Amino acid sequence: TLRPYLSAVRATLQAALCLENFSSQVVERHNKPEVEVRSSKELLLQPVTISRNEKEKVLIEGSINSVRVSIAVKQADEIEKILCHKFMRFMMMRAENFFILRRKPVEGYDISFLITNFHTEQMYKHKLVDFVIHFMEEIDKEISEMKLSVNARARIVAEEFLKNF
Amino acid sequence: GRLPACVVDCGTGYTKLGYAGNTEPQFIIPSCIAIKEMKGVDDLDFFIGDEAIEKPTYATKWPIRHGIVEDWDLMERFMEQVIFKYLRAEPEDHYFLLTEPPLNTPENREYTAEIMFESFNVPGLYIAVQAVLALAASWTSRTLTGTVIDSGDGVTHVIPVAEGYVIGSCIKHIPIAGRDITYFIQQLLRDREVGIPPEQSLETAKAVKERYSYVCPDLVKEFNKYDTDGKWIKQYTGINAKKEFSIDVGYERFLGPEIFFHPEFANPDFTQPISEVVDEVIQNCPIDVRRPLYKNIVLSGGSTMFRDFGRRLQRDLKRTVDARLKLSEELSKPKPIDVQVITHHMQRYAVWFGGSMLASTPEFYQVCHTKKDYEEIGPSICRHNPVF
Amino acid sequence: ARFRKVDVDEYDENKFVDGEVDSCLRQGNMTAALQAALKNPPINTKSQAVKDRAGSIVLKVLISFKANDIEKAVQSLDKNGVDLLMKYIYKGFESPSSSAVLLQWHEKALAAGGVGSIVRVLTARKTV
Amino acid sequence: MILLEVNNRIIEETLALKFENAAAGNKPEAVEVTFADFDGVLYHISNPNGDKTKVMVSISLKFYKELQAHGADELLKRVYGSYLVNPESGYNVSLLYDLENLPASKDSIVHQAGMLKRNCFASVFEKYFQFQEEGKEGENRAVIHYRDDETMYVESKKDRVTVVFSTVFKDDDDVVIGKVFMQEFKEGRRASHTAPQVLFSHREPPGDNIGYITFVLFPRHTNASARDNTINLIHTFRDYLHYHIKCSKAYIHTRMRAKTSDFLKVLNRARPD
Amino acid sequence: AYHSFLVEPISCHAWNKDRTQIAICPNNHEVHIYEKSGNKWVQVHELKEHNGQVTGVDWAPDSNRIVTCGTDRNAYVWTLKGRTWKPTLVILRINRAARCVRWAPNEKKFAVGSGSRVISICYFEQENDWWVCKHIKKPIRSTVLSLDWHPNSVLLAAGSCDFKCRIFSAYIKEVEERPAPTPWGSKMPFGELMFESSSSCGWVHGVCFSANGSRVAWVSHDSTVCLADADKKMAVATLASETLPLLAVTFITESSLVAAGHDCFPVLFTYDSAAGKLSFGGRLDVPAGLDSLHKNSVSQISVLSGGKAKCSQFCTTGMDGGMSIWDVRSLESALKDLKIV
Amino acid sequence: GVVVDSGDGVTHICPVSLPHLTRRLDIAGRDITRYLIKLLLLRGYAFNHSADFETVRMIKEKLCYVGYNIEQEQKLALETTVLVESYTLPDGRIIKVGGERFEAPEALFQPHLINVEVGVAELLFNTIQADIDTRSEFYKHIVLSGGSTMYPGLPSRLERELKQLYLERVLKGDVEKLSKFKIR
Amino acid sequence: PAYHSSLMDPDTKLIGNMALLPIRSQFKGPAPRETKDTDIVDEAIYYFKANVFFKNYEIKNEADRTLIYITLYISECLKKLQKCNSKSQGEKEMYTLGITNFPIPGEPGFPLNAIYAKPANKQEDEVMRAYLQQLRQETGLRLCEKVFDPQNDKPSKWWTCFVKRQFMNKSLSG
Ligand SMILES: Nc1ncnc2c1ncn2[C@@H]1O[C@H](COP(=O)(O)OP(=O)(O)O)[C@@H](O)[C@H]1O
């Protein structure tokens, strides 16, 4: 059920990343990501969701010049839950070097993206659609690696101590 | 609290660490970590300080490059042992005072905080600017305004400080530091003394630099004293790693620190005499702050320790500055300028000393960003650290 | 502050303002059930009630489907049909319980209706 | 470094420098050092009355009366002897070395000085290991508050000795990484059957952030020949655990630093250049 | 035939009468004019004046005049005086960025659409020696994205973000006179709403009038192309695409449209006058990880020669900073299945 | 008509002229640059108020602007990194500026921010509110003058502020519509 | 900084642009006799150890040009001296070395022709030539009672250490 989901997510990130520059209609000489300020109802598309199951899903919000993407990551148990939360927080702090990350997640999600017309301008939008998918994949992996890395040391550290008594 | 804060000055060649209130550091170790070169617990397999310098089965790394942290995975582990192996402090029980190099970015301060609050759970943190601490350390000889000539092993800085804050736009780097004075004395020796174990060339050199070198007022008159009353030539003896080799120590004694004033001697691309560099920096600062900056030229660093270093520097800076005032009067009556170079006992570790003194006061706990604030506002709070 | 807590923009005049299935189904004639459900969609009703009511009937038919029977069905609908379907598929995605089969229906409709069947879901002002 | 050391490096290097210069017949340096150790331990080395020929080492443990109701003084006296002196105001134990009166091998007293804190704890264990070695049962359980909000309970029985730690994990996440290490301890015997038995219990004794750890020591651990070592480990455990939980997160970082890095390479390959 | 001027978007473009020079805004506040020397392109000019990003460029063929509008809310009519162009400020009387501008075929006026939800019709008065403008507001409720003049220089089709395509009357009596009746209507006072589409979805990114102006077509974000016939009662023929939105469109014959956009390649659409139905017979670009000539969204398209009745060549500029020249005939060969009309 | 003129030293508001109704604001060009420096500090950038003034002023002039709805602008800076712009200092170093691009100029509407005791918005309102035969003509003839008025979005801000003030101190309910006035 | 010559009188004669200064010498040459106890060869040899480390030398007097010449020549001597076994052996090699024909201002092989004026006519050339050979011998000799220790066969290591260093990075053998 993984590839089916990532296929349905990809195609929606395809339709959604069709942006263009757009000067503010509300404010003089201003320019803002419409999906964020929502000050002009007609410029906002229909929010849509693509869910894999009752837990993992994605929210794609589009506007004439910006797309906001919110991923709900898989957290099988407590250990993954905190590892995930510590990993997303970690990247969000670096959102400035990540240029397409939202400093905070949309309430209800684990991570969020803010892709503006400027990004799709200086980055092959198809390659960006690949990133979001590449991303969703890699986080589930890295979380699994961290998980095993914790246990891998919990064992050595528990044997190292008991072997000495 | 009943427990003192932790104070850490991570220099590029030496890290001064200890508890606050103490006049001296509890440890001063080479800023290096040795590693294997990860599954299980390989990350925990490392050593630091001298222990890490020559581990047969390990590679020596130096995280702190040019004063700025180049490797954050390494700089974090170094902290792991600094805390659990040397200070033996439970980081969750002590506030920590870390130093930072001038021009260190805000992002970096956030990385440092991330490490301290996320990995070790410290209750409070304060990232102090080295130059300022160096100034407060001088109160030992008050104000936070003055010129701070800092020199260690990597390179030297001339940092103008106005009321607790550095004048970023007016700093200047000088391509001469401890490391250079050693390489120079090393050549001097290679061309005159025989019997010095190639693989112990630098070893010997550094020994002479700290043990015998000093700064003289005039070269010819110095060169003369030696050639005359050759009660100036000292002998040094070490062990060939196992027979003994003996050498005479001469000219290098005053020729080493000399390169600071006459850079062109060792360095081909730099020539400005430190005395001038200070002059230039103060000149580039606000007309209204210069005199003050001139009255409080403070030294800080293992490479300022040399005998008379402050006397020669001050003398040279007066000649430069006075001569300048002469041309004006001539050209046309400017009140003379008081150039004073302050030197105290706490100089070798001036920065850590200040951090140690300052972290014992109560106002320290008031300016520290607390863990709670870290959690409720985010790592940004560590971008600015109230000077006091 | 006070006088600022009021949103003058809200009042700015230059703003913008806009059984049968159970039969064929309970008889195994799946395809007919589909089209049957895709009929007169509540596209214009104010009540979420009825809107949600419809997608349920529609949803109830996508579940009652046999993996291999999907494509055939999809390909029996005109383009405007794949489109309304596609809108319903996304409706489904907002009620996990099914989400594995909708990922299939999706995949079929995407092959028939094209990525623009989606574009049209995103841009619809009057929707299911 | 996987196991935490037991000796305190500052006491050892401070004292070592003093003794060296003493033996070299050099004029003594005044000394004044305030430092800490784990579990809110506060030390103070100094020259009593400004007498530079005298170096005092003092340790202050908020939970000292407790260790004192369990053999503390008697043990300390046996260990240090004449070095022991009346505790300096604000401290519980004080060692005093006379720079003009050290032994031929300064390394035995130095090592022991470096273990002042370990030696303050030792007696509570030696006491009970002795209860089991003699059969004395029904003896009251020792209660040490080695921390403001953490406690250690010692008990002896017919065949074993049990130590329980009531430790706390401030960070809600640390409780989770903790549970991992703990589970692996509970299973340590699948690799050393003669090793001590470890039991765990969360939020509940045998708060969401309180956990109970239990080590069961059989005669092969608490006997005269193993006694000392067993103590070096057991009394440091609580800091061992918390040390590895933190180091653990430090590893999770280098991982995230590496991952994040990679992501930013992919994203910049998206650039038309 | 592709050429890259820069890797950053080419907001807009215009060609002189001979198709000898081209005016482009490189995602800049400026307008660089280029020209061909043998087979290379040389920057022969630079128009620095706007203080925002130039959103539209139009070049009056005969009176060799260039007009530009920007986000600085301004608009300048550029005149050639020897070896340099001179910018003349035109007041649009708006408080939002301008978005597009086009000279009427008679070159006596020019229209500017903007974020002020209004079109500004401008013409020069040789009595007061300056440019004045009149607005067309109702019923526009949002930003005006695109414009195209009818061959009569009165009717103007306008596309905007309120999801509509409209044809207004931009009749100025002080610069032209009573437009002969059209199939679009008889009464044509200033600003008169002659036609408005009925769709409520997708921003009309592009609009276009047929060679004779009896048909107007538009491409929307709801990923569809449309055409209305003044001869068939303004009967609109829609066609839904299975691909991404089209941003630009133009007729190349009376019954054919050529459009491009977010898919990054030009497609062909034909109109069945009889059946009153549109048909996609497109994709003219038959072969970064793209198989199209442009590596990003194509935002503009223009007829290079042949007019809109029998176009022989057309141009495309997009967000990849590239401009393309297409030979209608060279495409008909390379594709033995292609239609056209 | 009324003339709002904010330069480097002080900001004026002049009905037209009539000395009696004129008013001056103690916050203009330098005040903002100054406030900017203070902000770039809590950010981690140490700019000496004397030595780097000229520099920071160029920053202000290039990246600073007037937020329309501050609540809106604050969320942007806190939740996303779209406001962030890089600025290169003379010594080569590069710094980043975001939320402070609009916080600095905000002082014109909120003087207390820079510890000055109503804000050019409320000042303009009052100036006019206090001839009735000339009010409507003023409101529809406000002209900005000065270097410190070239902030992107400034006009829009005034208009929103005045509208908020008009609805509260002249009415209470919604009868705005006819409340016409363009600050062109 | 670098040490300058203070033997420049208002009445001093110049062979070229160098300063034709008096010297305590018995060797023959255009060298004016000297009354004062310190001659230019003195000054050169006094400041040599401090000047050789310099890379930049500002010329203030034509006297400096003479100082510089001697200073650079000393380096050429030490090259020789280094490799000999007795004060006497040294004095020999020095007459010889001071006799060899080194390049003068204006010739390829002479460093600093950008700071040394060339002899304007054949006479000057012959005069400058003899002066520059005079200096060379008065220095080379006078330089032997310095380099050797009262314990002969000893080229004082405190003089043989500058053999690899070049004043202003210039060599007369360059
Ligand atoms: N007595 C001394 N005289 C001159 N240099 C010294 C002396 N003692 C130490 N040094 C030099 O000081 C430098 C280290 O000083 P330090 O303040 O630690 O600099 P840093 O913090 O960058 O490592 C080394 O070059 C060391 O050789």
Ligand SMILES: Nc1ncnc2c1ncn2[C@@H]1O[C@H](COP(=O)(O)OP(=O)(O)O)[C@@H](O)[C@H]1O
């Ligand atoms: N584009 C701009 N946006 C905001 N402030 C600006 C801008 N340009 C200039 N300023 C500021 O406006 C002031 C200069 O305006 P000016 O009319 O010259 O004042 P004055 O006549 O008193 O010198 C300075 O504070 C300058 O930094």
Ligand SMILES: [Ca+2]
């Ligand atoms: Ca330092």
